[PDB]
C-alpha cells in the first residue's frame, strides 16, 4: 500500500541550487519506476550499473533522490568521471555510480522576465568535491596572498554565482531540473522494492 514519494521530488514546486543540492532518503516503501521509465517529459535518462529496464524488478536497502537545477549544457557533467565547475565544485558523481540521472527542461518553471537569480552555483573552491559531498560555505574565496576578512574585492571573490535564467535564453543556457536516483544496498534487509 505504501508507494514511494517520487512526486514529492520530481513534481516539487522548487529545486535546490546545485551547490546546495537537496537529498531525500527513500526507505521502506514500494517504488515503481514505471511512471518515470516511460515518460514524455524527460530529455535525459541515463542509468549506470543498473539497466533502466530491470529497474522495476531489482532492489536496494535505500534509495536517495538528489534534486537540483543547472543549465542544459552542463547536464552532461552529471555523470561519472566527468569534469567541469558543476562536477568539481557543486555535485560529483562517483566512478562506481549505480543509479539513474534524469533531467528535463524547465524554462516555463525556473526562468522569469528580467531573470531569476535564485539558482546559484559554486565557481570557486580550493579542491574538488568528493562523490556525494555538499558544500554550503559562503566564505569569501581568497585568490591572492593577502587575506579577505570577509570583504570582497580584488583576489577576494564571493564563491557563488547566480545562473540568471531568462526565458529568451538559448536552450543550452535554459534551466534543467535534475534528479539523481542513487541505489544503495548493503546486507541490511532490502527496504525499497518494486511491484513484485
Amino acid at each position, epitope marked *: 500500500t505504501n508507494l514511494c514519494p517520487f512526486g514529492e521530488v520530481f513534481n516539487a514546486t522548487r529545486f535546490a541550487s546545485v551547490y546546495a543540492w537537496n537529498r531525500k532518503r527513500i526507505s521502506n516503501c514500494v517504488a515503481d519506476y514505471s511512471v518515470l521509465y516511460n515518460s514524455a517529459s524527460f530529455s535525459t535518462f541515463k542509468c549506470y550499473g543498473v539497466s533502466p529496464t530491470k529497474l522495476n524488478d531489482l532492489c536496494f536497502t535505500n534509495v536517495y533522490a538528489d534534486s537540483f537545477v543547472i*543549465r542544459g*549544457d*552542463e547536464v552532461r*557533467q552529471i555523470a561519472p568521471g566527468q*569534469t*567541469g*565547475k*558543476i562536477a*568539481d*565544485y557543486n555535485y560529483k558523481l562517483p566512478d562506481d555510480f549505480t543509479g539513474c540521472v534524469i533531467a528535463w527542461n524547465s524554462n516555463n518553471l525556473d526562468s522569469k522576465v528580467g531573470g531569476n537569480y535564485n539558482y546559484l552555483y559554486r*565557481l*570557486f*573552491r*580550493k*579542491s*574538488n568535491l568528493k562523490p556525494f559531498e555538499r558544500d554550503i560555505s559562503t566564505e569569501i*574565496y*581568497q*585568490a*591572492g*596572498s593577502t587575506p579577505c576578512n570577509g570583504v570582497e574585492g580584488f*583576489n577576494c*571573490y564571493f564563491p557563488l*554565482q547566480s545562473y540568471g535564467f531568462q526565458p529568451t*535564453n*538559448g536552450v*543550452g*543556457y535554459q534551466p534543467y531540473r535534475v534528479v539523481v536516483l542513487s541505489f544503495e544496498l548493503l546486507h541490511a534487509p532490502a527496504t525499497v522494492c518494486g511491484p513484485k
Partner: antibody
Amino acid sequence: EVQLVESGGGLVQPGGSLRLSCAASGFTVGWNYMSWVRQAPGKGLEWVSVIYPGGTTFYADSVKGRFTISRDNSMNTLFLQMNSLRAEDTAVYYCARVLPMYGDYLDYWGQGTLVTVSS
Amino acid sequence: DIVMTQSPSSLSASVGDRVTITCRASQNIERYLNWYQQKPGKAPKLLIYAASSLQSGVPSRFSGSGSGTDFTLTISSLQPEDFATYYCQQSASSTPEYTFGQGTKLEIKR
C-alpha cells in the same frame, strides 16, 4: 602588485619537447583558474589550455595528448609541458589568470615567450 | 566550435574620432563575450567583459555593447596610444572552448 613572467621558450627541434614556466606574484596560482594562450607569428590568438583551482585541466583539440598543464604552489608557478612539437606550434605563449564570474575572461596576461620549432 | 568574425579587419581613424568594431558569432553566445587590446610586443590587456562591463583601470572612452550574435566595441575619442589590435573572445560553453576573433588592427590617421 600582480605580475606573470614567462620563461623557458626558445628553439625546439620538430618532435621535441619543452617546458614553459610562468612565475606569478600577487595571486597564488594554486587557487586560481589559469590558462595558456598562443599566438602564431603575425596571426591571431588561439586558446591552448586551462587549469581549474581544483586541478581539473582542459586542452584545445590542436594540443590534446601533446601538451599538459601543471602547477607548483611552493614556486607559485604555472607550467606547460609540450611534447612532440609540430611546426604549427611555433608561437608566442602567454599565461593568463582567468576569472569565472561572467563566463571566463582573462584579466591579467603574461607578456609572452616565443617558441620556435624548426630543424 | 564557435567562430568569431571581426569587422573590419583593419581600420584607420583620426584623433578624437568615434570608432566602432563589430564582432559576430556563428551561434548565440548571450553576453559571454570579452574584448582585449594588444599593442605590438606587449601583453593583451582586458578591456571589456560580459559584453558591456568595463574592466577597472581602463579609460571610460572604451565601452562595449551587444548580445547573442552581434557585439560592438566603441572608443568615443581615439587617442594616439590606442593604436593596437583588438580581439573579441567568446566564453559561452560551460567547459572551456574559448575562441577569439582574428583581430581588428586600429591605426591612427595623422
